Design a protein around this ligand. Sequence first.
Ligand SMILES: Nc1ncnc2c1ncn2[C@@H]1O[C@H](CSCC[C@H](N)C(=O)O)[C@@H](O)[C@H]1O
Lengths: 129, 215
Amino acid sequence: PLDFTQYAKNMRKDLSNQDICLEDGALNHSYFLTKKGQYWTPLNQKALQRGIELFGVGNWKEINYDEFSGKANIVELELRTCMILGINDITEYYGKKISEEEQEEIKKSNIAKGKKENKLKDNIYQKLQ
Amino acid sequence: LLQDIEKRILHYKQLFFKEQNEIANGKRSMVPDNSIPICSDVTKLNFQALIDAQMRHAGKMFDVIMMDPPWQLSLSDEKIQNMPIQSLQQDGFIFVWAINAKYRVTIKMIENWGYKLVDEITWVKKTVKIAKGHGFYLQHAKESCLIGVKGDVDNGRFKKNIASDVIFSERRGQSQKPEEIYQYINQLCPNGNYLEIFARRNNLHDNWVSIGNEL
Ligand SMILES: Nc1ncnc2c1ncn2[C@@H]1O[C@H](CSCC[C@H](N)C(=O)O)[C@@H](O)[C@H]1O
């Protein structure tokens, strides 16, 4: 005659760190699959996207200071950018600063291309070498 | 070989690409849904907030508490003793894991917080049946959980004679305690509020509050 599940929420709201649980007060499994301390927050995702628009792809050292101060594995960025553009080889786009409007298109375009080509895995287009 | 190395890297990014995608789709955490992890350092922690909320959403206080203090060889020994445990629970059991170095001190510690020592759980490490420990005077093949009580357990919630002093499990990623402790806690308290301090990520369970700086 206690609902533990509800009890969990309100506690989780005032007690647990913002990343740990959702606004409703449910607990977000994203935080718990990633290690540490290595969590990638929505908000700093916006920052990656913003960073590409300002400094361009493969500008991580310049991009890193501005939006992530330490802040991130150089790899995590490039891997995440591969995701933004929907390709798995990001080489083609390097050194180009791309607007958020356009990252959306490239991703949209690259994926459609992958799907028809029938070479898109995990929602990322695979690129021939 | 460059070709070999170049080849692996693409294969690798794909996993990551997949995992992030699965997460996007709702892939579950190992953690049970009902657990209530909190990340803090106890020294930093104000336990008032925890008490206010617990009283607020349960109108009750913890049935059980658990500890594996990070004994210095690393929180100051004084700091753990000085934690405001007494406020945290009013009518319940406490568990605490004492390395042989701290065994006496631990005793003095629970008594300090007003507990009465009533039982000790023993944990053996099985080869899969023996443990090799570099004991100072006798080699150690167990560590042990010291249990103390305060208040009325004559209450329905705690069930007497429901658990065994000895526990039998293999050691994983030590220091990681046997699963079966949480079962044994089910015997003692069935479906009642529990707490745990110094908690690591792996050991979270439903209905269990947990505080550690690694969460
Ligand atoms: N100052 C501090 N405040 C809070 N927690 C601390 C701390 N110093 C160390 N700890 C944590 O206390 C824990 C001791 S290890 C705990 C073992 C764990 N019970 C298990 O399941 O095996 C570690 O998580 C450590 O991160």
